[PDB]
Amino acid sequence: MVDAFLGTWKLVDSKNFDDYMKSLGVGFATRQVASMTKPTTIIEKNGDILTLKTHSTFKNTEISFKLGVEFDETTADDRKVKSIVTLDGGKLVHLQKWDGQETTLVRELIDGKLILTLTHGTAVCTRTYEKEA
Numbered sequence: 237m238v239d240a241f242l243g244t245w246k247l248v249d250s251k252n253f254d255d256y257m258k259s260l261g262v263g264f265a266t267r268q269v270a271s272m273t274k275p276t277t278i279i280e281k282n283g284d285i286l287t288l289k290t291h292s293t294f295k296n297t298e299i300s301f302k303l304g305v306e307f308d309e310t311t312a313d314d315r316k317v318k319s320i321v322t323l324d325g326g327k328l329v330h331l332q333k334w335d336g337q338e339t340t341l342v343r344e345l346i347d348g349k350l351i352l353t354l355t356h357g358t359a360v361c362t363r364t365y366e367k368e369a
C-alpha cells in the first residue's frame with residue numbers, strides 16, 4: 237500500500253509550477269523564490285498515520301493524517317483547507333477543498349521516481365522527486 241512512498245525525496249524536475257501557483261493567487265515575489273527552491277519531502281508512517289514534511293530554504297510545512305479521514309490543513313501559501321489523502325489506483329491522492337475551490341496533489345511512482353502532479357483550475361504541474369541516495 238503506501239510503503240513504497242516512504243522516505244526522503246529531493247526535487248529533480250519541475251514543469252508548470254508557476255502556472256499552478258498563479259492559479260492559486262500566489263504573488264509574484266513568492267513565485268519567483270519558489271521557482272528556484274528545491275524542497276526535500278519526507279514521508280513517514282506510524283500505523284495508518286502518515287506524516288508528510290516538506291522542507292526548503294523558503295517555506296516549510298508538515299501534515300499528519302490518517303488515510304481516508306478528513307483533516308484541517310494550512311498550506312504553504314496560507315490557504316486554510318479541508319483535506320483528505322487516500323490511495324487510488326496506486327496513487328497517493330491529496331484533495332484540498334476551500335471556498336468551493338478544489339486542488340489535487342497526486343503522487344505516483346514511475347521508474348523509482350516520485351511524480352507529484354498538482355492540478356488547480358486548468359493548471360497542471362508535474363514535479364519529479366528522487367529518493368535521497
Ligand SMILES: CCCCCCCC/C=C\CCCCCCCC(=O)O
Nearest residue numbers: 262270275290292295296297312313
Ligand atoms: C514547502 C515548500 C513548498 C514549495 C516552495 C514554496 C511554494 C509556495 C507557493 C505555493 C504553494 C502551493 C502548495 C504547495 C506546493 C508543494 C509543492 C511540492 O511539494 O513540491
